[PDB]
C-alpha cells in the first residue's frame, strides 16, 4: 500500500 | 536502531492543515512470534519514553518509523486550531469539567494538589479493538452524529452543544482536510453495558507520508445523568498507590 | 552538600532490631528565609530525584541540617526493623482487601482509600494546632485496650493493629530510650466525616538530636461491614487521576 | 543539641 481501507463507503 | 530527527516529524506535521501552534517536539529513539505482534518503544527525554503494540501487516526499521509518525500526527490533531478550540468549548462550558489533554472528567478532589466522560484517543480505531467490546457489551446501537437529541442523552444539555460541535468538527476535519481519494466514512458505534453506555467516534484520514491516520473519541454516559454519590466526601480522601515480597508469619 | 551512604549506614548501625535495609544511595542536599524563619531543604537522589524537607531555633549550618536528613531517613528506616516491619506485614496479610505501598495501607480495583498511614519524621504535637482548629473535638485512646481498636478498625484487624501500635511503643520506649523517658503521645480528633487518631513517638539516637515517628488511624463515620451501597458502585474502579494542565 | 511529652 503501504494495510488500510476500513470504512470507504 | 536508528534516530529520527524532529524536522522529519514537522515535515509530516507541516501537511496538517490548520496546525499553527504545535506541541513541543524532540527526537524519538526507536527500540523494536508472540502472535506476530510487533512492539515498538520510543525513548525521548522528555518525557523519557512510551510504547506501542500493533499488528505487523515483514517489518523493518523503515516502516516502524512510518508507524510512529502515523501516531505522532494523530496526537497532534488535538492542537490544530479548529478542533482544539472546539475542545476548549467543552472544558470551559462547565465548572466541574476537568481536562488532562487526553481525557476529561468531573468533580473529585486532588487532596495532594478524574471520572472519564470524554477520552481523546489518537492512534486508535474501534474497528481494530471492536471484538473485545462486542463480547463485553450487552448489545450495540446507532448514534446519529449530526443530530443532538442523543447528545442530550449522553451528556446533560449543559454540554451537548459543544460536545456535538466538537465531534462534528472532527468529522469535518477528517472528511475535508485528510480525505482519501475514495473518501472514508466515519465509524460511530455505541455499546450498552450494565453500568454505562460507551460510544466511539472513529475517523480515518489520508496523509502523504504515512499509510493512514486514525482518531477515535470515546464518550461514556452512566445510568444516572440520585447522583448524590458524588457528594460523599470519602471520595475527597481517595489516593492511589504495592511492593511484593515472600514473607511468612505463622 | 553531599552525604554518602557511609554516614547514613553509620547512623542506622545503632538502630536495634533492623537487619534488612533497602537500597540506599548518595544524595545531594541544597538549602532559608529570615521571614517566618524557615529552612526548607531539598536533595537529589539518582534513582528518584525528588525529596524536600522544619523550623530551627539556632543559626543554621551545613552540618546542622544533615543531622535532620539523618533524622528523617532514620525515622523512615524504622519501618524495616523486623518485629515492627512484619508487625505491619501481619495487618496487611490479615485482610485480603488491605492494599499497601510501604507508607499507607487501605479499594480500588482501577489500575486507595487510606485507613492507616505511616508518618516517619513528624510528631502530632508539631502540627497539632491545624487539627485542633479543624476538628470538632478531641479524645483519648487507650492503647492497651482492645475494644478501641475494635472501634476504629473492625474486630478482624483490631488485634494486629493494636500490638503493631504497642510494638512501635515498645521499640521507641526500649530501643530508642532516652535517659529521661519520653511518654508516647496518642491524640484523638473527631471530624464530621471521620475519626483520626495519632500515635507519635520520640526516640534517642547518638548521631541525631531526636527521631520522630507517628502512625495515623482513620475510622470513617460509616462501618466497613454495612455503607456498602456506596462501595458496591462500580463507578469505583472507573476513576483515576492525572494532571490538570 | 541546638522534648514534647515532658
Numbering used by the authors:
A (entry chain C): 761 to 762, 764 to 770
B (entry chain A): 3 to 34, 38 to 62, 64 to 119, 124 to 235, 241 to 256, 258 to 266
C (entry chain E): 4 to 34, 36 to 57, 59 to 111, 113 to 117, 124 to 238, 241 to 259
D (entry chain F): 761 to 762, 766 to 769
How do the authors describe this structure?
By performing a screen based on affinity purification and mass spectrometry, we observed that a previously uncharacterised phage protein specifically binds to two RNA binding sites within the CTH of RNase E, and by doing so efficiently inhibits the RNA binding and degradation activity of the degradosome assembly. We have determined the structure of this protein (termed Dip, ‘degradosome interacting protein’) by X-ray crystallography and show that it forms an open-clamp like homo-dimeric structure, and binding of Dip to RNA binding regions within RNase E is characterized functionally and structurally. As with the 756–775 binding site, 9S rRNA can be competitively displaced from the 583–636 fragment by Dip, and the addition of a 4-fold excess of Dip is able to completely remove the bound RNA from the RNase E fragment. These results demonstrate that Dip targets both RNA binding sites in the C-terminal half of the RNA degradosome, and consequently blocks the binding of RNA to the RNase E subunit.
To further study the interaction between Dip and RNase E, modelling experiments were performed to predict the binding surface for one of the Dip binding peptides of P. aeruginosa RNase E (residues 756–775). Secondary structure prediction of this RNase E peptide in isolation suggested a high propensity towards a helical conformation. Therefore, this helical form of the peptide was used in a docking experiment intended to scan the complete surface of Dip with the DOT docking program. The best energetically ranked complexes show binding of the peptide to a negatively charged patch on the outer surface of the Dip-dimer. To verify the in-silico docking results Dip was co-crystallized with the 756–775 peptide of P. aeruginosa RNase E. Hexagonal crystals of Dip were obtained containing an apparent ring-like hexamer of Dip formed through crystallographic symmetry. Discontinuous density was observed on the surface of Dip in the DOT docking predicted acidic pocket. Processing the X-ray diffraction data in the lower symmetry P1 space group visibly improved the density for the RNase E peptide, and we were able to cautiously model eight amino acids of the peptide into this density. The model of Dip bound to the short RNase E recognition peptide (Dip:RNaseE756-775) indicated significant contacts are made between residues Asp 137, Asp138, Glu 214 and Glu 222 of Dip and the RNase E peptide. A double mutation of Glu 214 and Glu 222 to alanine was sufficient to completely abolish the interaction with both Dip binding sites on RNase E when assessed by an electrophoretic mobility shift assay. There were no other significant alterations to the local or overall structure of Dip (data not shown). These data show that the acidic patch on the outer surface of Dip is crucial for the interaction with RNase E, and both of the RNA binding segments of RNase E engage Dip via this region.
